[PDB]
Design a protein around this ligand. Sequence first.
Ligand code: 08P
Ligand code: NI
Ligand code: ZN
Lengths: 8, 345
Amino acid sequence: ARKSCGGK
Amino acid sequence: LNPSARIMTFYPTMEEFRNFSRYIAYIESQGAHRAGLAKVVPPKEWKPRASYDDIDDLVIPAPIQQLVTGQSGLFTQYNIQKKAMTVREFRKIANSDKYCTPRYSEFEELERKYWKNLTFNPPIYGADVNGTLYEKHVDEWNIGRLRTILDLVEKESGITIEGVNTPYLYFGMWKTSFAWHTEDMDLYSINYLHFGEPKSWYSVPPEHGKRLERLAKGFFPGSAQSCEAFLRHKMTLISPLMLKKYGIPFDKVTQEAGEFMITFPYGYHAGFNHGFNCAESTNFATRRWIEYGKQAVLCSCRKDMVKISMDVFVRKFQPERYKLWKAGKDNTVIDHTLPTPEAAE
Ligand SMILES: O=C(O)C(=O)N[C@H](CS)C(=O)O
Ligand code: NI
Ligand SMILES: [Zn+2]
């Protein structure tokens, strides 16, 4: 798992 | 304390600034957390790094192009993966006439432009880069090692979650955005703007977070049907005028290079970059967070979303409730106004 900033 | 739940700014002395966790407890004693977001201006004598001129070759492995779709203060942002690029190249684009910050006088002007133009000329965000710009020798507020209890995850189970217990770098350009969200596991986050143009923020008080959620489900009912936690997808943008129209309390703040923003458990926030800049961020925790993590409502619909086992936190810090919780019988109601237990001092 990772932090992600963006939707898709 | 802070009954208006307005965003507070803090100017700690080097003496107060030295102990990270301690100071977070202090700003919570002053009601900072009620706003969901707080700013902290470091002692002027303090710098995390000497010069930024040597980073031009730093690789941004996965830039994303932000395509925003929608109207009338309600948008869904889509991300397009772009090939890797160096900071040097990125800056060229950010400053290029095509992508550069427009002209303006007062922030309110730039803000109206953001909300008018955000669905046009999709910008590129240098987001989620693994790494740190801190010099190894800097021991105050080091996003690389903050030494909060969030460290227990790694210490106990050896598990690393990038961006959460490790640092990220963000290279922004005008009109790049972060949609409305709280943190993974409703943790805190810390955000330091290393240099460049401002980053503006919006925030909803944790005590009002459920109202924002309900509003959002109403605006995007299909999305709420598909996933409860859909806001965690980080695709949802909502303008301040829309919040106003629906009576969601919120506050705004602009973060300038050299300043820290802190976000607090279950504080919803969103924002945009003014122009070329660079920020470093990660998550962290306090004892007060523990109950938030236990109750966090998480994204169901995507695989491998960040999920942290609370077991270690409950055993260590709530031994008296452990058996109850493991039994599904723990009824604790969160009071958003109450400061972290460390603020007793
Ligand atoms: O620091 C944060 O909590 C945050 O939301 N940062 C975003 C990345 S999601 C940003 O600076 O664009
Ligand atoms: Ni955030
Ligand atoms: Zn989901």
